[PDB]
């Protein structure tokens, strides 16, 4: 199942809702003990994480380090450790089972720091920082290689990217992206690392585009059928689905899935209430 945790719709949200794209039904779940919007979400294990984001609340207003645990067979949500510090709109990659949270903001602080979760001991270590600070950054993970891709540094929106190498903990500039994105979705499917959506500081963005590590290259595939910024992503059963978003006027509840072959996108469901900043991934169906 596609599960959704958290977003934003005139504030932070506690839901933890899971698609099923043969059924079309979503699933209420346990929801989370803190509402919390700009977070992420992954899987390890098959245990379902939220990392970062930030409580928007109509009595207060502050950034997020947390980092909590769901498990679908007790439909129940339990504390991890936190981050060193609180990271809004955070990007996050798995390798070799450890959670890397990487980039986010704190209040005026947009960070480059970066560091790593170790499931097995509920412990946090920085690592090397990313050659730039990034808010609304996409993470992937690609032969085990981290990639920060998009971003805000705090005055500028970013086309660049830039790949960590755990075991030699050192970020190295790419290929910087056709389009200028912060708040895009970015995923991968089977071989190539994809960037859909976000923001560029003028408009929300339908365009996505993909990166080949063979050719070193971004290449424009079909667009999405509504821009988006701040959208959720995820692939299930080698397609890509994206969630909500923000398109400048509305907050969308509007799924779109894209079949790589075909190169086509098409809306396959609607969230129950349109949201943005939410925290996607893919795990087993809860039980009982």
Same mark, same amino acid.
């Given at each position: ?56 609340? =109509? ?19 339990? =504390? ?48 090397? =920082? ?129 079949? =790589? ?28």
């Amino acid at each position: 199942l596609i599960y959704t945790a958290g977003g934003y719709f005139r504030q932070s949200l506690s839901y933890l809702e899971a698609y099923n794209p043969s059924d079309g039904t979503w699933l209420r779940l346990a929801d989370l003990q803190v509402p919390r919007s700009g977070l992420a979400g992954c899987v390890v294990g098959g245990l379902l994480y939220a990392v970062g984001g930030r409580n928007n609340s =109509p009595d207060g207003n502050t950034d997020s380090s947390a980092l909590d645990c769901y498990n679908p067979m007790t439909n129940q949500w339990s =504390p991890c450790a936190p981050m060193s510090v609180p990271r809004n709109r955070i990007g996050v990659g798995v390798i070799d089972g450890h959670i890397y949270a990487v980039g986010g903001s704190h209040g005026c602080i947009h960070h480059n720091s970066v560091e790593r979760y170790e499931p097995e001991r509920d412990e946090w270590h920085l690592v090397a =920082p990313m050659l730039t600070r990034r808010i609304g950054v996409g993470v992937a993970v690609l032969n085990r290689l981290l990639y920060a891709v998009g971003g805000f540094d705090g005055t500028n929106r970013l086309n660049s990217a830039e790949c960590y190498y755990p075991e030699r903990n050192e970020w190295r500039m790419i290929t910087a992206m056709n389009t200028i994105r912060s708040g895009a979705g970015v995923c991968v499917l089977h071989n190539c690392i994809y960037a859909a959506g976000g923001y560029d500081g003028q408009d929300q963005l339908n365009s996505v585009e993909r990166y080949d590590v063979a050719t070193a290259t971004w290449t424009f595939v079909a667009p999405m059928k509504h821009r988006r910024s701040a959208l959720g992503i995820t692939v299930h059963q080698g397609r890509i689905y994206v969630l909500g978003g923000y398109d400048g006027h509305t907050f969308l509840d509007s799924v779109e899935c894209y079949d =790589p072959d075909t190169d086509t996108w098409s809306e396959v469901t609607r969230m129950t209430s349109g949201r943005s900043g939410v925290g996607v991934a893919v795990t087993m169906e809860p039980s009982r």
